[PDB]
């Protein structure tokens, strides 16, 4: 269903909500375990984001949980609706090729923010970037 509206989709307002969510979080040394794409196996910027975008979905549901009707909770919902819209921009075929992490919640938030931010950057340059077959890229894993 991919379209020229793959850009204009990740607004700055989205990134602000993420930043505010990040800024609200208490700086603590505690680490949380989560599944995410390994930068080593995927040096390719375009195929890294492709694999990451899929994983961010599970992260926001499982990890990024907030009290109902709180500003952060609403921000998360919007980011999730955003991700549904970002679907049909990413072409995909057949898991794995990923690694377990053990980082602070703030570091997790920075990863997710980076995923959304860099995806916006690339789509501004060209909205049809993430429609490439990374099956070959997903082989070297």
């Amino acid at each position: 269903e991919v379209s020229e509206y793959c850009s204009h989709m990740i607004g700055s307002g989205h990134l602000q909500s993420l930043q505010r969510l990040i800024d609200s979080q208490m700086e603590t040394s505690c680490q949380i375990t989560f599944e995410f794409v390994d930068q080593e196996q995927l040096k390719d910027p375009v195929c890294y984001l492709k694999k990451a975008f899929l994983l961010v979905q599970d992260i926001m549901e499982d990890t990024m949980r907030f009290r109902d009707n709180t500003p952060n909770a609403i921000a998360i919902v919007q980011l999730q609706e955003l991700s549904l819209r970002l679907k049909s921009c990413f072409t995909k075929d057949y898991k794995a090729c990923v690694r377990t992490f053990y980082e602070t919640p703030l570091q997790l938030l920075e990863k997710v923010k980076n995923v959304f931010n860099e995806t916006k950057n690339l789509l501004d340059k060209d909205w049809n970037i993430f429609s490439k077959n990374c099956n070959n890229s997903f082989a070297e894993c």
Binding site: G11, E81, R85
Partner: protein
């Protein structure tokens, strides 16, 4: 109204059983039901007969009989259960589309009514239902998600509890759509303008969805202006900003026009040069 024999609301049979549904009216009648194999159909003037020798789980569902040519006649119905020990679900559709705040029926038909006490709705890959998912179940129809939301646009599965293990139906994709009233809301300002040979014209459009175009055109020749795009207050904005640091060739009829799947909308102004 036509008459179905047997006069029973529902039937429960094993795979392999013989099922024979007969309908009778005054005028010609016809059956409708699940698209399923092994059905034989016998029909004459006033009656019609569905029959199979090898009933399968796919035959599970409501079979409705109507008498065409009788208007306001009404219909008669009967529900068939084929309790396949291996196949608890007969999914009628793997795709469902609704709008927000509508009920969303996921048509997975249970092949054995006694299983109802141990059924549930889940997402693919074992994930749980989205938070605050209001839903209920009917054996004849399937799971209905009440007041569906855009966020619930997911791939679902129907869970049946058989011998301890939960057995899944094939996936069912649900599409929930934002109710988009019409074309993108335009704001072209200023409505009137007149300058001596600076000026600014901003063409803007906003919709809850991102999938919409907007263009600013001088006369009928559209201008190539890079549009600024941002998301705020749960709405997408797309703004074309024209900056003329002016002359007689810039004057004219600037039309601000935006389109989407709904249709095209247009607003305009006049620019004079003295």
């Amino acid at each position: 109204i036509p008459v179905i024999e047997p006069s029973v609301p529902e039937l429960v049979v094993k795979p392999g059983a013989t099922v024979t549904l007969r309908c009778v009216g005054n005028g010609s009648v016809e059956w409708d039901g699940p698209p399923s194999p092994h059905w034989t159909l016998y029909s004459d003037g006033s009656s019609s007969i569905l029959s199979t020798n090898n009933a399968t789980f796919q035959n599970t569902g409501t079979y409705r009989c109507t008498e065409p040519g009788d208007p306001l006649g009404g219909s008669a119905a009967i529900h068939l259960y084929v309790k396949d020990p291996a196949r608890p679900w007969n999914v009628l559709a793997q795709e469902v589309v609704v709008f927000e705040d509508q009920d969303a029926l996921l048509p997975c038909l249970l092949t054995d009514p006694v299983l109802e006490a141990g059924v549930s709705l889940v997402r693919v890959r074992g994930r749980p239902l989205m938070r605050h998912t209001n839903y209920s179940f009917s054996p004849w129809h399937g799971f209905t998600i009440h007041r569906a939301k855009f966020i619930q646009s997911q791939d679902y599965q129907c869970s049946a509890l058989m011998g301890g293990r939960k057995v899944m139906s094939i996936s069912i994709r649900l599409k929930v759509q934002k109710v988009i009233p019409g074309p993108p809301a335009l704001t072209l300002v200023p409505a009137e303008l007149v300058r001596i040979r600076a000026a600014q014209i901003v063409c803007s459009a906003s919709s809850v969805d991102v999938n919409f175009d907007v263009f600013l055109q001088h006369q009928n020749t559209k201008l190539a202006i890079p549009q600024q795009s941002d998301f705020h207050n749960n709405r997408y904005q797309k703004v074309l900003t024209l900056n003329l640091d002016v002359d007689f060739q810039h004057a004219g009829n600037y039309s601000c026009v935006a389109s989407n799947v709904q249709g095209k909308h247009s607003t305009s102004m006049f620019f004079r040069v003295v």
